[PDB]
Amino acid sequence: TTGRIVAVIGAVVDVQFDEGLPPILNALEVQGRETRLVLEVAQHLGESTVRTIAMDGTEGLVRGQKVLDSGAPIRIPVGPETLGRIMNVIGEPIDERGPIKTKQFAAIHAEAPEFVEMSVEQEILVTGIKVVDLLAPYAKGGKIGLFGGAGVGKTVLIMELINNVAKAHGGYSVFAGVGERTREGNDLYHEMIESGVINLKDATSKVALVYGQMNEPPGARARVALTGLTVAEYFRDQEGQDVLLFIDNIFRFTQAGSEVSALLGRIPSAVGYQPTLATDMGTMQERITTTKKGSITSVQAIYVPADDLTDPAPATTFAHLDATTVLSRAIAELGIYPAVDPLDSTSRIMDPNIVGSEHYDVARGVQKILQDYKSLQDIIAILGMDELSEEDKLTVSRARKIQRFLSQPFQVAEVFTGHLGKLVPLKETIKGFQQILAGEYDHLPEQAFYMVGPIEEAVAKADKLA
Amino acid sequence: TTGRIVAVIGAVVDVQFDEGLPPILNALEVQGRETRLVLEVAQHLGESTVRTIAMDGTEGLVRGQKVLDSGAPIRIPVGPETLGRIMNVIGEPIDERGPIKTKQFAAIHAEAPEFVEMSVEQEILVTGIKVVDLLAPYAKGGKIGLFGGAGVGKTVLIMELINNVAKAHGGYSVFAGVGERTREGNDLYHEMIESGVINLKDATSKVALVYGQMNEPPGARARVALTGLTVAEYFRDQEGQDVLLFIDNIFRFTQAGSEVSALLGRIPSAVGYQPTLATDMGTMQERITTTKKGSITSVQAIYVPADDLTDPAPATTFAHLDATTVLSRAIAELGIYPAVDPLDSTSRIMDPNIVGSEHYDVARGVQKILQDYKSLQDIIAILGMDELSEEDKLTVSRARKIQRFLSQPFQVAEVFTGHLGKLVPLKETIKGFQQILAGEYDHLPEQAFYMVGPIEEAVAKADKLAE
Amino acid sequence: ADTSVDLEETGRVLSIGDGIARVHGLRNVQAEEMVEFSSGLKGMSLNLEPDNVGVVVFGNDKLIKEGDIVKRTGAIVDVPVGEELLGRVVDALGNAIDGKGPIGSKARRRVGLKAPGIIPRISVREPMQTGIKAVDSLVPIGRGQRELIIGDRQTGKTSIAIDTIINQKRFNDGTDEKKKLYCIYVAIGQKRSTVAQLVKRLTDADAMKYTIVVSATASDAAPLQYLAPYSGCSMGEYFRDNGKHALIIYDDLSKQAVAYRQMSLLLRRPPGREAYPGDVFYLHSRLLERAAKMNDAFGGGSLTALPVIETQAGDVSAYIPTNVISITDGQIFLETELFYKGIRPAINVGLSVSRVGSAAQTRAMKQVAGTMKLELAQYREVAAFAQFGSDLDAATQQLLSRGVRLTELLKQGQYSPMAIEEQVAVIYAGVRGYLDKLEPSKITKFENAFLSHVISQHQALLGKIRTDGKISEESDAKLKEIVTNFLAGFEA
Ligand SMILES: Nc1ncnc2c1ncn2[C@@H]1O[C@H](COP(=O)(O)OP(=O)(O)NP(=O)(O)O)[C@@H](O)[C@H]1O
Numbered sequence A: 001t002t003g004r005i006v007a008v009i010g011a012v013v014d015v016q017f018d019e020g021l022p023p024i025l026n027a028l029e030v031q032g033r034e035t036r037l038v039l040e041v042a043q044h045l046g047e048s049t050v051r052t053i054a055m056d057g058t059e060g061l062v063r064g065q066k067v068l069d070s071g072a073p074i075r076i077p078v079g080p081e082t083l084g085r086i087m088n089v090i091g092e093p094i095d096e097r098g099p100i101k102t103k104q105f106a107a108i109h110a111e112a113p114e115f116v117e118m119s120v121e122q123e124i125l126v127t128g129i130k131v132v133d134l135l136a137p138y139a140k141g142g143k144i145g146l147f148g149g150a151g152v153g154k155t156v157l158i159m160e161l162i163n164n165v166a167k168a169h170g171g172y173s174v175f176a177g178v179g180e181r182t183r184e185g186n187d188l189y190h191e192m193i194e195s196g197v198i199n200l201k202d203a204t205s206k207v208a209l210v211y212g213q214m215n216e217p218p219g220a221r222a223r224v225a226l227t228g229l230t231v232a233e234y235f236r237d238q239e240g241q242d243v244l245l246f247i248d249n250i251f252r253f254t255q256a257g258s259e260v261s262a263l264l265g266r267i268p269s270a271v272g273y274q275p276t277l278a279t280d281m282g283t284m285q286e287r288i289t290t291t292k293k294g295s296i297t298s299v300q301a302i303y304v305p306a307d308d309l310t311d312p313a314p315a316t317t318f319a320h321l322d323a324t325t326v327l328s329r330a331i332a333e334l335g336i337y338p339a340v341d342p343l344d345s346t347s348r349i350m351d352p353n354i355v356g357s358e359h360y361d362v363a364r365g366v367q368k369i370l371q372d373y374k375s376l377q378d379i380i381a382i383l384g385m386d387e388l389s390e391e392d393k394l395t396v397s398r399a400r401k402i403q404r405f406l407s408q409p410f411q412v413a414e415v416f417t418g419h420l421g422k423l424v425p426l427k428e429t430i431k432g433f434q435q436i437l438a439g440e441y442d443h444l445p446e447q448a449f450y451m452v453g454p455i456e457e458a459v460a461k462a463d464k465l466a
Numbered sequence B: 001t002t003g004r005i006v007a008v009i010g011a012v013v014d015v016q017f018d019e020g021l022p023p024i025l026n027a028l029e030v031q032g033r034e035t036r037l038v039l040e041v042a043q044h045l046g047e048s049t050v051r052t053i054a055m056d057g058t059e060g061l062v063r064g065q066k067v068l069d070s071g072a073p074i075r076i077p078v079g080p081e082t083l084g085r086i087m088n089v090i091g092e093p094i095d096e097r098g099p100i101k102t103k104q105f106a107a108i109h110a111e112a113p114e115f116v117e118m119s120v121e122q123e124i125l126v127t128g129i130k131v132v133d134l135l136a137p138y139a140k141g142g143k144i145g146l147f148g149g150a151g152v153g154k155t156v157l158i159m160e161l162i163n164n165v166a167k168a169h170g171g172y173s174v175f176a177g178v179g180e181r182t183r184e185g186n187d188l189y190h191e192m193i194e195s196g197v198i199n200l201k202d203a204t205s206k207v208a209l210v211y212g213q214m215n216e217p218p219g220a221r222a223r224v225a226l227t228g229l230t231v232a233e234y235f236r237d238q239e240g241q242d243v244l245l246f247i248d249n250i251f252r253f254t255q256a257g258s259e260v261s262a263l264l265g266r267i268p269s270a271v272g273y274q275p276t277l278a279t280d281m282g283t284m285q286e287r288i289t290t291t292k293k294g295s296i297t298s299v300q301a302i303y304v305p306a307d308d309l310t311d312p313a314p315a316t317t318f319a320h321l322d323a324t325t326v327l328s329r330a331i332a333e334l335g336i337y338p339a340v341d342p343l344d345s346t347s348r349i350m351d352p353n354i355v356g357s358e359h360y361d362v363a364r365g366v367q368k369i370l371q372d373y374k375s376l377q378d379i380i381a382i383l384g385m386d387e388l389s390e391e392d393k394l395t396v397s398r399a400r401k402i403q404r405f406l407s408q409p410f411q412v413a414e415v416f417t418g419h420l421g422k423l424v425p426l427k428e429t430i431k432g433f434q435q436i437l438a439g440e441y442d443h444l445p446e447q448a449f450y451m452v453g454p455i456e457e458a459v460a461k462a463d464k465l466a467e
Numbered sequence C: 001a002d003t004s005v006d007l008e009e010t011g012r013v014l015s016i017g018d019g020i021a022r023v024h025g026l027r028n029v030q031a032e033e034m035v036e037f038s039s040g041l042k043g044m045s046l047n048l049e050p051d052n053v054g055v056v057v058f059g060n061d062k063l064i065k066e067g068d069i070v071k072r073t074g075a076i077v078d079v080p081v082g083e084e085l086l087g088r089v090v091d092a093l094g095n096a097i098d099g100k101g102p103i104g105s106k107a108r109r110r111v112g113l114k115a116p117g118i119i120p121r122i123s124v125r126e127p128m129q130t131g132i133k134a135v136d137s138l139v140p141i142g143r144g145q146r147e148l149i150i151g152d153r154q155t156g157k158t159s160i161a162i163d164t165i166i167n168q169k170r171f172n173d174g175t176d177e178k179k180k181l182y183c184i185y186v187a188i189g190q191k192r193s194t195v196a197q198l199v200k201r202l203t204d205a206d207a208m209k210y211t212i213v214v215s216a217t218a219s220d221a222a223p224l225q226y227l228a229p230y231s232g233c234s235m236g237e238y239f240r241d242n243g244k245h246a247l248i249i250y251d252d253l254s255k256q257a258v259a260y261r262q263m264s265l266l267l268r269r270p271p272g273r274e275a276y277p278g279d280v281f282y283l284h285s286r287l288l289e290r291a292a293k294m295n296d297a298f299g300g301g302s303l304t305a306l307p308v309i310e311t312q313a314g315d316v317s318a319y320i321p322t323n324v325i326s327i328t329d330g331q332i333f334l335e336t337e338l339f340y341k342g343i344r345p346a347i348n349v350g351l352s353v354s355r356v357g358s359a360a361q362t363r364a365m366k367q368v369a370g371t372m373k374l375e376l377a378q379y380r381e382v383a384a385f386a387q388f389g390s391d392l393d394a395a396t397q398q399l400l401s402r403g404v405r406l407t408e409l410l411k412q413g414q415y416s417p418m419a420i421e422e423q424v425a426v427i428y429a430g431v432r433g434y435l436d437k438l439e440p441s442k443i444t445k446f447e448n449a450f451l452s453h454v455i456s457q458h459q460a461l462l463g464k465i466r467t468d469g470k471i472s473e474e475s476d477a478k479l480k481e482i483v484t485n486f487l488a489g490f491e492a
């Protein structure tokens, strides 16, 4: 079918049809352009007109211009031939390596797996990260989320995890760059090449890359997630072997939606967000999941605007995770890295019948001392420690030592910490924390605990401090 | 005249009349319904179309449906045969006891008494509640207001007042449940009966009931208060023997308006309220009043959204009252019931020339000490108590005691306190406080003062506490 | 003369988007009536305008297009109802989602029906035992009562609901039909895997048999999420209206409101305070008023509601949180501070209430916990007032000593709802000062030991307390004997 461009406002192009009106979600191709310009149908305005969202810049478009009904929604190459490649929202290569020659194609819009399709197995996923493993352990085939205000550690954490987990996976991985920095895509790509995850020689790559960065128009940013998403779906259902899915940053998708929402002509909701915020997030999040057919371990970065965790975007996100790593600027400013808030991060796995009672007891142990310290803080703030009870002073010491012992150098952050990255084994963590709690180190100085791996190193650091 | 329904959107229904447009406020009856559905005319949109507010559910209504102009605002059965009965927004019995056979009917809408109709008598109305009486005494025939956020005791307090006052009345009483809990209407009804205030067998009924609960559409809620008020005005004027008016909760009237306001096409005022908030309140509050013909003693419960006393609604209400009992979550949270805020409650009769200097000096005395203590609170909190002058550490004492002596176990809250309700007489109150202020109990422990009636009980409790 | 598509019982889509269809025709539709789309997709007639009908779509609007034929149904929205539903997982419309076959429903019910008036009810008097000491002792819940579970994310709100559903096996596996409690659990905006998790646990506990689970999850259309609570409600009224007893959990009403706000804004109804429709209050009142206790004349049945609300930054004073607090018969407020501190459940005694009071407790429990609430309040105060041992008398030292001991007793793990007599026995011990001399750190351990003793040895005292439902003079004597002696041996 051939419609005509009736109106243009930013990424919202209205196209009129005479004989066949394309259904909602269909991808149209604008005629008379140097490069592909797909328009995704959003709604039927009536009058044989359809309101659509452009998948690329709309400059140059002219009223009256011809539009062609592709006859289907945005479809993209899916299969193993995507592994090691970089692709668009619309599935075109962007790595300058020729066409992605796949047998099948898949449309970005799909329904979420049904209820009967759900899975309930809960296995812990050890990361080697002290705070994570001890207080808010991830879980195989689970949903993980890394909350963080600007420049707090979301990305670094995603890298360290790709490093500590992705690298020794044995299965596939999909990295979806959503609304983030292009340089980052480039940084990862080349790095991936270097470590051999991406092989431009053989067919041995284990990662497929999808990107729709900070330079794309809203519509692109609003769909790349779906794109990356689809790629992963294929490996999950169509092949049966466990996938890994990294997204940086999923907040960008929601932001993108708000960018076009006014244009779509909707009465804004709270904070100027689109009234469809929750549903939008929902029909999308619901596809990022493990099922009886396959497993999807997903780590998503979630940017928090103005550092406000009550912002509708992040706020509505919590409900979709199985484990949440909330990063804090306050902690980061203290020099603690990763800047994870130990009293704000949670995990469904934190259950004695899953991590064991030793693990469950240390964890709650650490939290209770940190909570206690937190309450003392107001007073410490005006009057310092002097007026503190001998008993109280001991919680403060311990807390400040536990607080420090929670930090740790990442390989990925070596350039900044000035220390060699460390990977602590779960039992190592449970232990080192027990002792601290148990007053087995009330003699060592705080500093000894800062930036170290296993407790053993914290003892040594103490000697070196003399 | 007979109009047709042209549009339906929630509680608002637009009607098109071919000939003769029913005036604003008129009540229309929807044709073809198992139950009676009244539409109050709200506006004249033009084009022979009126915008209305439904007094009930709008489900099943159909475009084109038939509507007959009743030719008059909502009129309800008013008179003595209302006593002991339960009524609707539209004057329909809802107690299953058959019709209400009144001689007359009255329109719920009506002008407020003229300036030359006002009264100025001011007699204290003793309640038996320590706090109220001491600090913010009610006045016979005056306007009383009970302010509070969610679950602070607005209702319970209203309950104890019915007990300690309504019960020994000797005149009528009207209780209008506006946008409150249905469960409550049932509790109250059955209580009135079990206590003979309501008599199902004879004509000894001393109280008429009117209900428009939380399970109603905004339209009903925007009107029950009028219904209830209308009943009450009758006993004021037509008969005149002194009436007690209870409304719980008047906020609901305001929130009802706000709920349909957008559908009426209005730019919202501050805090989402309708722009006509104040006036709406005015033409209503203005009828709730004592006149030369009769006397009304209205006790209205007043909801405080988000606990913010500055909220346009609670804020706008203050002016209409003569006495105000402010409840506080902060106080409640401490276990001090009634949760009245001693420094935020007021009464127009708190005048030496009216209650006398003993009452007056005690009250003020009690207030000064609490204020004194409030000031210190935050400070000793951090800097400790040592550095405090013995002079100052005695007010800390006394205040803490008074703070307790102000509490009281209500008769209506036994299920809550696990204590037998106490009713203290005015003189027992003034005296007990007088003494505490006077240093006459600096020996007993605070706890002794907590949850007791008269000072003697505090002394007794001390011993019992002695071990 | 093909007369199948007249504009009186049919209509044609003028435009569609964001789940809102603007149907032309439908001249005879009633407000709130269900229609049908060519695609078998159901809608709901919300705005009857002069020139068009605003239809709310119960599904993916992707299947709808301008011009589609819309057909009336002549029916105001309703759903399956009755015992067939037990042990099954349905969607917001009644359809099964557990892939366990069709529901054998014989009855139906309108989702939106006014709640019973003044006349048809009777004061709440029968307890609704949660199995949680803190709740059952301080914020008692009676049948026909509405008690709100409110707090921040992850404070443990759902858990309160699960323990309560699980605790019901006691009576359900029993003989007496009056004591039985059929449960309904409504998920709203939640996540499919979580719900799947949720129904697993229930199954593992052998609680699904008596539970219905209405699920309207994250990906479900706004209208489904919106309807969900009313649907589940209607299912529960079936029991309520038939002299049976039901318990409904609305988890959570926060997500529903959002759904409402969405559905509402898309219909172009002007946004109110905080962007919500001016009638959000009404949205919840209407619903929760349905939970009720019917008089013997109506079957003596009931409906008890436990709605969930999610605050932000522990702020209960917030508009929605207050809106809902002002409807229900009390609230259970959970704080994360409490939780991290080791107080689990994270119930905040001060801020929580039960507008039913002791009327919803057994005499045995009223006996032990009659004044405890205000006590604990007064304790929290002084505890504060002396965070500097300001020359503290005795009466306050005693106050502090009880306070602390009592607080430890109120603690409780998950999934182990206790029996009423068990609660009484343990509260008894503290309330009677028998523990005033034990070390606070010991209290938890003691309770486990003690409770072991009485359960194993003394089930004669337990069954009496439970049976008589009161604490007789001898029972009160046999108990004193047991605690004091056992305590002594315990402190060896
Ligand atoms: N684990 C870490 N150890 C040490 N320094 C770190 C760590 N994580 C982050 N930083 C420092 O903080 C900077 C920002 O980290 P990064 O992970 O990029 O934050 P982000 O949340 O991804 N920021 P943005 O995406 O801009 O909001 C890094 O370049 C480091 O200088």
Ligand SMILES: Nc1ncnc2c1ncn2[C@@H]1O[C@H](COP(=O)(O)OP(=O)(O)NP(=O)(O)O)[C@@H](O)[C@H]1O
Residues within 6 Å of the ligand: A347, A348, A350, A351, C151, C152, C153, C154, C155, C156, C157, C158, C159, C160, C344, C345, C412, C413, C414
């Ligand atoms: N009594 C208890 N003792 C110990 N842990 C508990 C208790 N009750 C709940 N939990 C745990 O506390 C956490 C919070 O429980 P949950 O009931 O999900 O809270 P919530 O407010 O529903 N969270 P969310 O639904 O994510 O906002 C879970 O990990 C539970 O296992």
Ligand SMILES: Nc1ncnc2c1ncn2[C@@H]1O[C@H](COP(=O)(O)OP(=O)(O)O)[C@@H](O)[C@H]1O
Residues within 6 Å of the ligand: B148, B149, B150, B151, B152, B153, B154, B155, B156, B157, B337, B338, B339, B409, B410, B413, B416, B417, C353, C354, C355, C356
């Ligand atoms: N005077 C009182 N004595 C003891 N407890 C009270 C008292 N007033 C209120 N409470 C407690 O507060 C709860 C809420 O009171 P209520 O009158 O329902 O508040 P409101 O009507 O202001 O929302 C009661 O159910 C009870 O538990």
Ligand SMILES: [Mg+2]
Residues within 6 Å of the ligand: A154, A155, A180, A248
């Ligand atoms: Mg980043």
Ligand SMILES: [Mg+2]
Residues within 6 Å of the ligand: B154, B155, B180
């Ligand atoms: Mg009330």
Ligand SMILES: [Mg+2]
Residues within 6 Å of the ligand: C157, C158, C159, C251
């Ligand atoms: Mg939950």
